Structure formats: structure tokens, C-alpha cells
Ligand binder design. Structure first.
Ligand code: HEM
Length: 214
């Protein structure tokens, strides 16, 4: 479509359905998630967000990204560290895995943030708006399926205390995205990089599912 936010939604509709149909997610939605599986994804995401937010800080002043800088509201690295500490203990840093698919994703995140800053939006969009959407549904399912503390320990990465209303916040995020100045061509490169982003997540779920099956 014309507005970037609409073009992104249109461009990733197919890979989104594919992400929901991935074995790992299908099971998660139906309440079939294990402590081992949840630990795995959380660990993998700690790396992805670490790399992602490291690149964001690098371009927080770059006009091609500046409008999407929301450290207090969205940044997930700290929350993920809290979950990892809960699941793996004080020495989580050294106990957590770093799978091939996660590294491949982290790599892409450094390339983009490093030399293609105008595409970082595609990656932030894919992870953050997803956390505020499907993530909100999954959060509730996980607390039940994993019989977690009613206080929220273990699910801090799904919690955005600095956001009163995710739905409302996403509309504001879309507004900001449509504020970005870029040619139709670069805009296409953006929607195209968001598919790549979903594909990196898909590949990551397929790998973890493969790792878990045993
Ligand atoms: C358990 C599987 C999933 C379910 C059930 C799900 C469900 C949804 C729903 C219902 C929406 C629409 C907004 C809302 O009403 O909340 C949405 C949006 C979105 N999801 Fe997912 N989702 C899932 C997995 C994912 C994954 C794995 C990603 C990314 C890696 C993702 C990324 C997004 C994005 C970026 C949007 C916003 C699209 C836009 O409006 O431009 N989702 N999801």
C-alpha cells in the first residue's frame, strides 16, 4: 500500500500465517509448551534482542530510524535477563545455549544495523509489534501451561509495564513508521527485509522444535 505500515502488513501476511503454522507455535497456541522449550526460545531471544537493541542504540539519532526509538516502552533485553535468571539461575549467562539459527539471526541484525540502517525498522517492527500482539495471547497461555507465579516471574519478556495499551501503542508505532522519509524503492526493500525477518524466526522455531524432539 501507500503508507509503510500498511505495506508491511500486506507484505508479511503470508509469512505470518506460516509462522503460526510452524510446529513449535501451533503447539504453543494449543497450550502444548514445555519448560525446556520455553527456556530455549527465551535464551535464543535474549541474544536476538541483545543484538537488535545494540544496533538500535547505534542508530537512535539516524533519521531513518529515530522516530521508532522507544527504549523505555519496548526494549526487551533487561526483561529477558530477568526471565533467564529465573529459569537458569544467577549464572544464566554461562548456561544458556546459542544455537546456529540464533547466530544466523544475530548476524543479519549486525549487517543491517551496521550498513543498512534504513532497514532496521523492518526488524524492530517484526519483533516488537509481534510481542504486543501474538505475544500477549501466548503470555497468558504460558502462565497456565507452565503453572507460573501469579506475580509474573518468568514472563517478564511479555510484559511492557511502560505501556498502558498495546493496541493503542501499535497504532502510535505505525504512525511513526509512516513518518519515515524514503523512496518507494527503499520502502520495498523494507517490506522485503521484514519477510526475511519472519523467515529468520520461522527457521529459528523449526530448529528449536528439532532440538526439543527427543
Ligand atoms: C503463536 C503464533 C501467533 C499468533 C496467534 C499471532 C497472532 C497475531 C494477531 C491476532 C495479530 C493482529 C494484531 C492483534 O489483534 O493483536 C498479529 C500481528 C502481528 N504479528 Fe503475530 N501472531 C503469532 C506469531 C507471530 C510471530 C512469530 C511473529 C514475528 C516473528 C509475529 C509478528 C506479528 C506482527 C509484526 C504483527 C503486526 C502486523 C501488522 O499489523 O503490521 N506474530 N499476530
Amino acid at each position: 500500500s501507500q503508507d509503510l505500515s500498511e505495506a508491511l502488513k500486506e507484505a508479511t501476511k503470508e509469512v505470518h500465517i506460516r509462522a503460526e503454522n510452524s510446529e513449535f507455535m501451533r503447539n504453543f497456541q494449543k497450550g502444548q509448551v514445555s519448560r525446556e522449550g520455553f527456556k530455549l526460545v527465551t535464551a535464543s531471544l535474549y541474544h536476538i534482542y541483545t543484538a537488535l537493541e545494540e544496533e538500535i542504540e547505534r542508530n537512535k539519532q539516524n533519521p531513518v530510524y529515530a522516530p521508532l526509538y522507544f527504549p523505555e516502552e519496548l526494549h526487551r533485553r533487561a526483561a529477558l535477563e530477568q526471565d533467564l535468571a529465573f529459569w537458569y539461575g544467577p549464572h544464566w549467562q554461562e548456561a544458556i545455549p546459542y544455537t546456529p539459527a540464533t547466530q544466523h539471526y544475530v548476524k543479519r541484525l549486525h549487517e543491517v544495523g551496521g550498513t543498512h540502517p534504513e532497514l532496521l525498522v523492518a526488524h524492530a517492527y517484526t519483533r516488537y509489534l509481534g510481542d504486543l500482539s501474538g505475544g500477549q495471547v501466548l503470555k497468558k497461555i504460558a502462565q497456565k501451561a507452565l503453572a507460573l507465579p501469579s506475580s509474573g516471574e518468568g514472563l517478564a519478556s511479555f510484559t511492557f509495564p511502560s505501556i498502558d495499551n498495546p493496541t493503542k501503542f501499535k497504532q502510535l508505532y505505525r504512525a511513526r513508521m509512516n513518518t519515515l522519509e524514503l523512496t518507494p524503492e527503499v520502502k520495498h526493500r523494507v517490506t522485503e527485509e521484514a519477510k526475511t525477518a519472519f523467515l529468520l524466526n520461522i527457521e529459528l522455531f523449526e530448529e528449536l522444535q528439532a532440538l526439543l524432539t527427543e
